[PDB]
């Protein structure tokens, strides 16, 4: 049944896209949204949020299962991941446990703040888009009423102006709000993964028994939105 739901979602997005695809109407909405948003976020912060959304959309996060396998193998012994590699190098170079904890928690908080800022930017875009669509529709109504020439043209011309509103709605519930939700999901996934890395690195440096750390990390795995999967 998974294929059916995936295909129906893809078809809904495709039909909404061809409804979107028509050029100046979306331009008004996006220009107004960008102008309103830039009063709260700089250009650099907006571009950072766009990079965040990209990295979250085209780069799948690391599964906790393979992370668990890697920490287990390296704890019994004594890589593609970047946080894991940096923590590994940090303890190998020789450092106290407390400074390693501070560095790992600082990186965790930095990533969480970055993802929260991206979520805020995209949520602000979501709240702003329908209002600018409405404004564009009202301006189009003003223009059509001022250029009232042909009665048979009353229908289609109005349909153009209202089009702007539609675009806002389509951009509000299916582009920006979904991106913010995906950003929150990716932030939760990264927080869980980085907490697993922190616990595993601390256990390895302290030299705890692998069985108890595996039990604790499975307990970590069995919470959150993943609780439905079991």
């Amino acid at each position: 049944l998974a294929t059916l739901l995936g295909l129906i979602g893809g078809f809904a997005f495709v039909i909404m896209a061809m409804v979107l695809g028509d050029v100046t109407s979306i331009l008004i909405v996006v220009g107004g949204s960008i102008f309103v948003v830039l009063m709260k976020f700089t250009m650099g912060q907006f571009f950072g949020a766009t990079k965040i959304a990209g990295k979250a959309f085209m780069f799948k996060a690391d599964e906790p299962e393979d992370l668990i396998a890697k920490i287990v193998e390296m704890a019994d012994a004594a890589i593609n991941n970047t946080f894991m590699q940096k923590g590994i190098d940090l303890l190998v170079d020789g450092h106290d446990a407390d400074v390693v904890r501070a560095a790992l928690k600082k990186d965790i908080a930095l990533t969480d703040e970055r993802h929260t800022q991206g979520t805020g930017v995209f949520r602000a875009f979501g709240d702003v888009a329908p209002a600018m669509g409405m404004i564009g529709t009202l301006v189009g109504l003003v223009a059509m009423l001022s250029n009232m020439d042909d009665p048979k043209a009353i229908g289609p011309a109005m349909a153009v102006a209202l089009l702007t509103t539609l675009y806002g709605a389509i951009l509000s519930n299916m582009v920006f709000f979904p991106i913010a939700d995906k950003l929150s999901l990716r932030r939760d996934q990264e927080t869980l993964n980085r907490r697993l890395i922190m616990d595993g690195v601390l256990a390895i440096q302290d030299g705890q028994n692998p069985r108890v750390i595996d039990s604790y990390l499975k307990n970590y795995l069995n919470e959150g939105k993943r609780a439905l999967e079991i």
Binding site: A131, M134, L141, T165
Partner: protein, 47 residues
Amino acid sequence: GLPLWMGTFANLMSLLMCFFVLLLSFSEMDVLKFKQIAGSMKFAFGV
């Protein structure tokens, strides 16, 4: 609560609606057009 823009939406909605009422203040009904409209309505709703 409700989205903040919804008010304007209602306003906007109401606006054009009343204009349509104005368009109906000087309109003349057509029986044949009503007949095709009713037939299309019946066909669309699967009845």
